């Protein structure tokens, strides 16, 4: 016969190593011109502790490095990317820390000096968090870092420190949505009650490689000094959920399931009309103010009724 040759292992590597890659599901930013415009957009870091997330390649890395910074420490996950990172910590002595680990469970509470710490109410801290991560990880992570500023713990032992960080265009859009707008939504309420949130830029999916689908948002961070609603996280984040889960009816359809159905029709009732809310308002319309109200009317029906905070309406559902 005649059969067609055998692969070299050139071809068989790179076989291997381009579904390797097409896997892991990170969008590299191989562009300095890009990384630096990331890092100049997020504020000077001038003498700033920098922690990186997931820097992967290291771009964004490289950006940090040239912008005075006090000290880098970034947390990666993948292994193969980690001793790069160490060729580039010995091109900068001193400057860099590199821990092999998850971003969503590692703590930097202990990775800066106590002394850079800073109240509250004070300037936000000489600490700054960066990164340009996989859209898998972004999402659970900024919900971890929302209920922590929420605590004042985990990053926010340092006092309001800064984030800036990539999402899809479509999570960025959700994040500093404002009320009326199609993206208003769930994580509106969630980073806006508790930050100060603006979309710096966008970038083009082409230029990440691999090509994402999508596009990615740029989002600068920093906590509020007097956060939009005060009350527990968990409290907070039932009720938006609630009231977000059905958009095109009234909200208080959302707001009802809260509530066992024997007591739906009335106390739904009082809830939106303790907090002085239209019943008939469709859940784009409910801005943090209302969110506001609706909390704190909750909250004192959750203490009237311990029964009430840990009703699920589907366990109910199951007849």
């Given at each position: 016969f005649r059969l067609p040759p055998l692969p070299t292992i050139r071809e068989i590597i790179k076989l291997f190593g381009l579904r390797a890659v097409k896997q892991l599901s990170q969008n590299f930013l191989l562009d300095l011109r890009l990384?630096?415009?990331?890092?100049?957009?997020?504020?000077?870091?001038?003498?700033?502790y920098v922690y990186e997330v997931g820097p992967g390649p290291g771009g964004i890395t490289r950006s940090i490095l040239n912008a005075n910074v006090a000290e880098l420490l970034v947390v990666e996950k993948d292994t193969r990317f980690i001793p790069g990172l160490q060729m580039l910590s010995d091109a900068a002595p001193g400057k860099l820390?590199?821990?092999?680990?998850?971003?969503?469970?590692?703590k930097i509470e202990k990775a800066f000096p106590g002394n850079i710490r800073r109240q509250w109410e004070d300037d936000p801290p000489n600490v700054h968090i960066i990164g340009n991560l996989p859209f898998s990880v972004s999402t659970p992570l900024i919900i971890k870092w929302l209920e922590n500023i929420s605590l004042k713990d985990g990053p926010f032992?340092?006092?309001?420190?800064?984030?800036?960080?990539?999402?899809?265009?479509?999570?960025?859009?959700?994040?500093?949505?404002?009320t009326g707008s199609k993206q208003h939504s769930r994580l509106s309420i969630m980073?806006?009650?508790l930050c100060n949130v603006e979309h710096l830029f966008t970038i083009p999916g082409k230029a990440f490689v691999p090509k994402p689908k999508v596009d990615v948002g740029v989002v600068?961070?920093?906590?509020?000094?007097?956060?939009?609603?005060?009350?527990?996280?968990?409290?907070?984040?039932?009720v938006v959920q609630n009231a977000f889960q059905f958009r095109?009816?009234?909200?208080?359809?959302?707001?009802?399931?809260?509530?066992?159905?024997a007591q739906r029709l009335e106390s739904t009732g009082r809830l939106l009309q303790l907090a002085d809310i239209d019943?008939?308002?469709?859940?784009?319309?409910l801005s943090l103010?209302?969110?506001?109200?609706?909390?704190?009317?909750?909250?004192?029906?959750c203490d009237e009724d311990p029964q009430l905070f840990t009703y699920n309406f589907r366990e109910e559902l199951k007849q």
């Open positions: 990384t630096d415009k990331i890092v100049r957009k997020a504020g000077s870091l001038a003498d700033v820390r590199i821990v092999h680990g998850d971003v969503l469970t590692y032992v340092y006092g309001r420190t800064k984030m800036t960080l990539t999402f899809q265009k479509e999570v960025a859009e959700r994040l500093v949505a404002t980073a806006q009650y600068h961070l920093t906590p509020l000094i007097e956060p939009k609603i005060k009350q527990p996280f968990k409290l907070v984040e039932k095109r009816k009234y909200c208080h359809r959302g707001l009802g399931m809260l509530f066992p159905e019943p008939t308002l469709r859940p784009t319309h103010m209302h969110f506001k109200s609706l909390c704190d009317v909750y909250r004192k029906m």
